Each structure stands twice: as C-alpha cells, then as structure tokens.
Amino acid sequence: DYFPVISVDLQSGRRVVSVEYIRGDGPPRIPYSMVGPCCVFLMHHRPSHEVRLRFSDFYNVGEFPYRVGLGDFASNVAPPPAKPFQRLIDLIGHMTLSDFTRFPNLKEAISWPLGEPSLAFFDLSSTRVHRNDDIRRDQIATLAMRSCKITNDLEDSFVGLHRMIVTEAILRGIDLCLLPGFDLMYEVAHVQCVRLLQAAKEDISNAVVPNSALIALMEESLMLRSSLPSMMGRNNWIPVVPP
Amino acid sequence: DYFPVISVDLQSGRRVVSVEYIRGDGPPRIPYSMVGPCCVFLMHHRPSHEVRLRFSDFYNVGEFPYRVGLGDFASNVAPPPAKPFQRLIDLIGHMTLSDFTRFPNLKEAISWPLGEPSLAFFDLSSTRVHRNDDIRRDQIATLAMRSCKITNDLEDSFVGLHRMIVTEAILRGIDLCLLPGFDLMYEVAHVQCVRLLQAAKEDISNAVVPNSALIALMEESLMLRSSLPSMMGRNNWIPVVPP
C-alpha cells in the first residue's frame, strides 16, 4: 500500500532526516505493522497478534505488535489507564515555540527528546488540532526518526523512541502504567509536560514575567498539588543558568 | 562505610551535578549494592543475589544485582563474551579532547551520552591508566549522574545509563551480547567507539588532515573490515554539516 521512504536532506543549515509515505503496491510486504497511522515493515522483529500491556513486552523478546493505537480495530498494546495531561497538551499545542524559548528552563524542558526545542509532539498529541492522516503519519515517522538520529531503520526508530520515553519516565519518577507505548506522541508530550512542570518552578523562582505558557503550567501545577502531587514526578530538575 | 553525597555546583558557567563519597558508618544501610567500586543504596530496587546474564534482567523486574563487575567476588551480572574495543579504548584514553573536536563528525560521535564532547569514559575504561579506587568511584558515579541529568537518585542513574547504552546499541546495530551491564564505563566507551568508527568515514570523505585519532580509527576500521565487519555497527550515521 504505502512505503516509507527515508530521505536525509539539508534544511536550515542542518542535515536532517525525513520520512515520506509513497503509494506503491507490487506484491505487498508480508511482515508489517501499524504504529498509529504509520506502516512499518518488519525486518528484525516478528509481528505478533497477542494483546499485551506494554510495547516493550513485544520488542524486548524480538517481536513487534501487529497494530497499535486508536482506530477501528483492537490494539495489541492495551491502552493506558488514563491520558491525564491531555488538557494541558491541548492547551500547549495552540501555542508558539517562542512562548517557551524565552525562558531558559522551559527551553531545556522541551529540548528533549530531539535535542532541540520542539512543540511537534504537543501538536501531534492535541485533540483540538485536525490534520489529514497522511500528513500525520509522515510527521509521526519523521519525529520517531529524528529522536533517534539514525537514517535507515524505521521499526528500530519506534523501539528507540519508546525506550527513550521509558528511560526519562524512570529518571523523572513518572508512573510507567501511563506509558505503555499506546500513542507514542502522547507519551513524549506527557514526559515533556512533566519536565515543563518541574522547570516552571525554577522559572518562577528566577522571577520572570509569566506568559500564557507559565500561567497554564502554574494552573496545572496547582491543581495537581491539590489532587495528586505524585503525578508531577520527582523534584530532580537541574536549574539552568540564565544566559 | 561510604555514603554518596550528590552536590549541584556551578562550574564553567554551567550548573553541574557531582557525586563525592564520604566516610561514615553509624548503622550501615541494609539494602545496598556495589556497581564496580561505587556503593549504591537501594530505595526502589530489591537487592538480588542471583546470577543473571544482563543488568536489565534485574532492574526490569524491580530488582538490582547485589554486586557487579570485576573484583575479588562473583559478579551477579555474568561477564560479556568479550571486550573487543579494549585496545582502541586504551589508545584513545591517552589522547586529548582537542584531537576529536577539531573534526565535526568525531565531536558529534563523542558527544553522546553527556550531550557534550567527553573522553571521560575512555579514561575510566582504559587499562593503561592507573587511578585510586576512591577517585575512580567518585568519577564513575559523577558520570552516571551527568548522563541522566538528574540531581537526586543514584541507582536510577545507573539504570538510566544502562538503558541509554542499550538504546544506542539497538539503534546502531551493536550486538547486545557485549553490553550486559558488567562494566558500564566500558559499554559507554564501546558505543562511543562504534559511533567514532561510523563518523570517521564521513570525516575522511570530507578530506581532512588525519591526526592520531583518525589514524587509530582507520587502522581499527581496516582490521574490522577484514575480520568482522558486522562489529562496526550499521551504516546509519547522519553526516554533520561542517561549520
């Protein structure tokens, strides 16, 4: 049906990876998987039709779930109990990058996982943004590839992105019941939200002038402190020296 | 016996984490582990005395090996089949950082995992450098903490460092039989060596003047191409635009 084509091109004085899905049938590939809208062709992983709790429960044993995510089907990775930052994500996705890079700690918080500030995962996780499925799949695969900084393999990019998510969750004390690999863009945006909530403390401690970003983050922090403080992660954020 | 004390201090205009081991007995802590020379006190992980093949076989089930590494004891993580880059590591550890940062691709290759160029893991993995065990343990714990960029937990720093190693191994096609968590500094230096070998191709393709670094890397690449090409990883290195 659709083949991913990975192309390394020069943009903004940086050589960056992109993925574009192109129509082509011939004989369709037999081993394949659907990670959200993205079609992945499995070279090193055996597709599996079992339903398991975590994405890692597949790729840790050399397998790959048949199909994952929301849709007119049954995901082979059982959905998380909740997506508790979805309101904050919807609120951030309608904001510009300059709202965060003006503050150092917020910039550092959203630097992960691409190594540069980026609100792309917030846009792809928001429910109040509407995009075609083709552009969505291209952007999701591109972000998975750009997180891992490789050029050739796409299934390993999704495995690496989930592994990065779980590593940051373990470091920041995020509960792993909420990050099973169901909707990888939401997991990245969730961990970025936890990092943002930890960074906003240092930003207000540095006596900055709140914009909409800090107002939203402080409202969320207040509500969470009242209801479920442990959801905000651990307090192990390195303050960023102001330039 | 020795307690790790984690201190976040300003150095070189950057706020950075350090770990220093300080003598103190009182009642010694009951749950504890030895990762190499480093003493780790387990809050979230149950110590285990079983012998397993991978470090991940412990921390993936909420455990932590009793003691790991070389020494007058039996490591609870079975040693790797080989440490095949030890000669290259010994050769690189006697070199200065400026030998790599002069080339862009080598600088990018050794940027991982700390996000900045660093030969610290090469120094701590080399066999032809001699250091006291106290300074060694301080440096190992400091590097584990600085890889993860957190400030408070030390066992989670070692778990995160191993998870980062395995993520990069999976991305670069490195065989995971060689990275079980036995000597984490060697694993970091091994993955950095694979990245360096992949980057030296682009560096010579950019027609640079070889220094000792490129000479050593090309000799190793030639020997490996003759004997075991698959040890050099996959050819998925993004070329770095020359500044």
Structure tokens at B75: 């490591």
Within B18-154, residue ranges assigned H as helices are: 56-59, 86-93, 98-101, 104-111, 120-125, 133-148
* Closest-CA distance of chain B to residue A103, Å: 16
Are B13 and A151 an interchain contact pair (Cβ–Cβ within 8 Å)? no
For residues B45 and A170, give the distance between their C-alpha atoms in angstroms, rounded to a whole number.
12
**Distance to chain A for B154, nearest Cα, Å:** 10
Please state, in angstroms and rounded to a whole number, the distance separating the CA atoms of residues A63 and A76: 12
Count of CB atoms situated within 10 Å of the CB of B152:
15
Residue A129, CB-side half-sphere exposure with 13 Å CA sphere: 20
Under a CB-based contact definition with an 8 Å cutoff, are residues A119 and A92 in contact? yes
Most A-contacting residue of B105, B147, B171, B175 (CB-CB within 10 A), to test interface: B171
* CA dihedral of A12, A17, A21, A22, whole degrees rounded to 10: 80
* Measured torsion, CA atoms of residues B47, B49, B55, B58, in degrees rounded to the nearest 10: -60
Is there a contact between A150 and B167 if contact means CB atoms under 8 Å apart? Answer: no
In angstroms, the CA A109 to CA A141 distance is 22
Contacts of B149 in chain A (CB under 8 A): 171, 238
d(CA A237, CA A241): 12
Considering only alpha carbons, which residue of chain A is nearest residue B150?
Answer: A236
What is the least distance, in Å, from the CA of A240 to any CA of chain B? 7
Residue B14 CB partners (closer than 8 Å, separation 6+): A241
Of A151, A152, A236, the CB nearest to B150: A236
- Listed by start position, the domains of chain B span 1-243
Closest residue of chain B to A162, computed from CA coordinates = B167
At B63 the three-state DSSP class reads: strand
- Classify strands A14-23 and A2-11 as parallel, antiparallel or unpaired: antiparallel
CB A145 within 8 A of CB A19: yes
Tokens (6 digits) for B51? 């012998």
Torsions phi, psi of B14, nearest 5? -140, 135
DSSP summary character for residue A240: P
**Spatial separation of the C-alpha atoms in residues B137 and B156, rounded to whole Å:** 16
| Cα–Cα distance measured from residue A142 to residue A159, given in angstroms and rounded to the nearest whole number | 14
The terminus-to-terminus CA distance of chain A in angstroms comes to: 50
